[PDB]
Symmetry: C4
Subunit: 325 residues, 4 copies
């Protein structure tokens, strides 16, 4: 295991684990909790912190920014990343047009109280904006020192390749990373497609929702000590998914996986996370945590890593029976 | 109907209707009226506001800028555009030379009290300036964050193509839009030529003078409630056009069109404007208004849109008998 | 005659006559005189004012800058140009290296109290600096808004072409003008070589020393009312040239030319200057003046222009017997 | 001999001798000593001063910066250079990634109290960073005015060529110089490889450790008046090298060289340094000095230069018996 690795083939070194701020900062948890969670993460070697202009309507960014100024950590020791797409109710306040990328990132930076982010991501694809406009815009903010690199999220392999094509044709800067969902019940893209882009154009993979929003911790049957999101304001969809006919099917397999965990001497959450890092293809996994206990338990997945043999992996595949092909 | 659409093939989303500031702001109407007209427009979904360094010798821009700071609307919810060409009596204070484009836009920005405009247009072609110099200059102000995009106005298809040629040869930024005159008595360019540029190089069309400066409202025989421009200082030309042998010919056809309007249950102005939006090729129509009544009547053209059948259109063509070919 | 014309094929319009500041501003004449000379020039339509970082060790630039702020003329109505090369006694304070072009122009701008000059010239060729470095540097200051265009001076046709080559190969900005010496006794370059560059690469010609530092006014035998430079501090070389065996030869021909002048009803200085403007190839002639009388007499050459027939020109050639071939 | 020469084929003129700041400024010597050493160097024509973000943890840069502001020397008369690579204990605080090059140089500039350095070097190769990212980053800081040129150090010929390749393929700025070790016991690279890069891609050579950290002054057997570094904190390696079986072998040859020195009428240090400048291929030699006596003795090597005949050189080769092939 390598705690720090390159994000894709770029020169940006990130910790294999990062702390995100979705649903948490400026929302579910208190600012005191947030400051505690980031300090723990930072003091434990994590240098990657992800946020977005849409999270808690900018509040997540403000909190994140406040913790950074309050703690006084050197900017050069942090790797801050934020996503852009949804930045307001006005028509021109969403998308990947040059206008919103400039205005959006500028706004996030003000809220974050930072001159620049290390990586600015397109939170998702934009059907209404030509790839050229977007790539120039991304290239622009980087040349303006508002960001060091840029990445994509929820983009198809072809779309990412199109970005690369545009960059090479007009001599702009290619994307260095894709933020994809990755957990035992969402594997195809990261396991089959992303490696392809890594070898062809050096694009790295930063994954999110290691526990499927908490579903994989088993907290909805055999879970670890924490709070509940499925029962949070506006997450009726999450509750539905969990209570769905299939929600029960996966919740059943977790029981079998829970076994392997005990057998390995770690919690289910730790198994699931270390599982995401088995991939050499995954540069870093973004953690989600509402309390210090969950965070440290998760950060413990690092230890579960060496004890993950090929047969243990194959055994996992059989239980999940969804290995990508 | 789509209220918001892309300006050409760019990522900039504009309202199908915009409010201009020619003859009005800083001139014909009072600042109080102006603030009232823009607020109405803004509150009704219009995000496109056009001006020019030449309008009322910069006063139009100042008023526009004052309304924006006074109202406090978010910059990211507005799409401001201004034209450059005539910026002073000095020899070097006019044209499309790098010198005037930089100095001109910089001046408009100061008067507008804005860091940048969304689109900066060349108010007209410049015979004395090489296309390369102009395109570099436009590309320059965009890279300097003084503007997000640039467009042309009163340029020929070939000239616009030449701009595009220059941009692709030296890797500069192509124009995204052409501001052309468009109303029932001026159709050829927008109906026949502009679509060609849209498909070939993604150039969009933003039209102006939907009512031919007021002539199409019939206010010079069967017009709507408002004031008179043809009788304004320096518009002797407009009065002449209206009193011309042909001025009477078109004023005659309006009578026939006025019929269709009543039949449709809308005013002549509404018919004429909704007529301009029938085109999928027209990204947005710039309105001209000296009072709140005219503005709301015009903004009503949106409703007249669905009730505009092909036969109604063909019937219009027969009355006008000028359909482009 | 066209009072204003394009500098080369660029979009920058200049007056056929400009006022320079060599030997004069911050040196030979008083600041009061300078302010008077520029005001006269400006009020008479001249918008071109040339200076250099070397002139009076920067004082010329300071004076020029002071007159501009004091008079309050709009920056957009002026065309300021300065040359760079000799900017200090330190090794790295001279040349056309990126370092000196940046530092040199930045210094001139501070002394001039201006954000930018319209044209920055290389005062002369640099053997110790690669053309690429120089062209990038020039391109750089233009993109940084420190200058609008750049030109060369005392460069050979080949050198200018090499600059153009570099610009097109790396997509940098080509030079738009060459500042060459031009008067009845220095003709070859401007009459034979410069036109070639104008047609091939649009390079314009801005000429200097219309009177050969005063020698052509005949003030050293049959001259106009003024002061003496040949007898100034450090111009022993000028005195020598005038007293040279050839100095007498040319001083003899002036006598014959003086005749043609009277015959035309103008002074010798006016003849000589209007002679420089007969060329369509000369965009502008930089005047040198130590007092208001000389300036207005010179500015009068404009009138002598129409009365300059082909036979009068041919008659001049015979007297000079140095027509270029 | 030419006291000032071009650094490689660039336009940057440097003194054949420069003063470095490794081990000295902010460390071994006092700030008073430092100010004295730089003043001597400056007053003697040296305009080249090298430092690094790693030297004395930034203190070297601070001292250097303080001397510069205190003395008030014109920025345009100095050639400041610093190296980037090791800038902190955090993972992302080292390397040649865009992130560290920007943050690192920005930090050095703050400590140096300067807007820019003349040349920013990569202190060494980075295996974890793609050449493209590095060259863009270097090109970026130059375009941002944080540096005038950039160079490499401890890079292989191939690596330097790869940088050049990247620059020409994406139209970025190539490196102008390589900082290589060079003294009588380290010759291969500077004598055989560097000339190759100079002719092929104009890369110049700036050498360091003319005395092999002091070993060549003979101060460890027959040395000049000064202090001892081999016995300094953390230089156990240097002491070891000197006491090594080979340390004695070279220390033996010095005895023979010491002879030639007396015969030439100069000190061993002077011989060794002037030896480094015999090369037309070496643009400049960076001196190391802990006191004014060493500095002036070294600066004296300039005089030893003319008295260095081919036979004297050949005689040196025989004693060293390591001439490159
Ligand atoms: N680019 C994109 O499209 C997206 C990126 N992301 C990134 O990834 C992060 C999101 O991960 P998220 O998706 O929130 O979640 P995870 O899948 O990592 O689940 C974290 C949630 O699971 C619960 N949990 C965590 N650890 C434990 C534990 N040890 N025991 C029990 N329960 C535990 C908590 O639930 P509770 O709160 O109920 O206590 C917590 O909020 C974000 O911060 C963001 O940066 C996320 C979504 C989209
Ligand atoms: N780029 C270019 O070359 C140009 C661009 N434009 C753009 O378009 C806009 C100009 O439109 P304009 O050309 O002024 O005008 P329109 O053709 O839209 O006519 C508006 C005028 O008609 C009258 N009017 C408007 N609505 C009504 C109504 N409902 N009933 C009766 N009369 C009515 C008013 O006359 P009155 O004032 O007499 O009451 C008003 O000033 C500008 O704001 C500008 O941004 C305009 C010209 C050139
Ligand atoms: N780029 C380059 O390499 C160079 C550019 N230049 C440019 O051109 C200008 C230089 O012109 P300069 O070269 O000074 O001179 P000119 O050839 O135009 O001669 C001007 C001088 O002649 C005398 N004079 C002018 N008008 C009259 C008159 N009507 N009657 C009698 N005597 C008269 C004066 O002499 P006195 O002062 O003795 O009274 C005056 O200083 C500078 O300002 C500079 O901008 C100049 C040199 C090099
Ligand atoms: N880019 C890179 O990788 C590197 C670049 N460099 C550059 O070159 C410089 C380093 O040179 P350095 O490598 O320090 O040394 P040198 O080989 O020039 O040796 C200088 C040392 O030798 C002694 N000395 C110097 N002159 C005399 C003399 N006349 N008589 C007796 N002893 C003398 C002193 O030892 P004492 O202190 O013991 O008195 C002094 O510190 C740095 O300043 C740096 O800028 C250096 C290393 C790496």
């Amino acid at each position: 295991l390598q705690f720090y690795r390159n994000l894709g083939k770029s020169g940006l070194r990130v910790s294999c684990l990062g702390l995100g701020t979705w649903v948490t900062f400026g929302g579910q948890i208190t600012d005191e909790m947030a400051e505690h969670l980031m300090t723990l993460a930072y003091d434990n070697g994590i240098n990657l912190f992800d946020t977005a202009e849409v999270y808690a309507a900018g509040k997540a960014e403000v909190v994140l920014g406040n913790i950074i100024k309050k703690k006084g950590w050197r900017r050069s020791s942090l790797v801050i990343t934020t996503k852009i797409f949804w930045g307001g109710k006005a028509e021109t306040e969403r998308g990947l047009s040059r206008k919103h990328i400039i205005e959006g990132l500028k706004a996030s930076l003000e809220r974050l109280q930072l001159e620049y982010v290390d990586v600015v991501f397109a939170n998702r694809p934009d059907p209404n904006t030509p790839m050229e406009e977007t790539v120039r815009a991304m290239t622009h903010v980087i040349n303006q020192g508002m960001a060091m690199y840029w990445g994509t999220s929820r983009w198809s392999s072809m779309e990412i390749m199109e970005a690369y094509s545009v960059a090479r044709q007009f001599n702009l800067i290619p994307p260095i990373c894709e933020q994809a969902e990755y957990h035992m019940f969402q594997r195809e893209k990261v396991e089959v497609q992303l490696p392809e882009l890594f070898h062809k154009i050096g694009v790295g993979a930063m994954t999110w929702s290691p526990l499927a929003c908490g579903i994989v911790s088993g907290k909805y049957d055999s879970g670890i000590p924490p709070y509940s999101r499925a029962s949070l304001k506006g997450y009726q969809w999450l509750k539905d998914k969990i209570l769905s006919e299939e929600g029960r099917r996966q919740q059943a397999k977790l029981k079998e996986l829970q076994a392997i965990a005990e057998r390995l001497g770690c919690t289910l959450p730790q198994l699931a996370i270390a599982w995401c890092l088995r991939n050499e293809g995954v540069s870093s996994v973004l953690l989600g945590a509402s309390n210090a206990e969950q965070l440290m338990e998760n950060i413990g997945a690092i230890q579960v890593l060496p004890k993950l043999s090929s047969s243990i992996v194959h055994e996992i595949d059989s239980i999940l029976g969804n290995k990508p092909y």
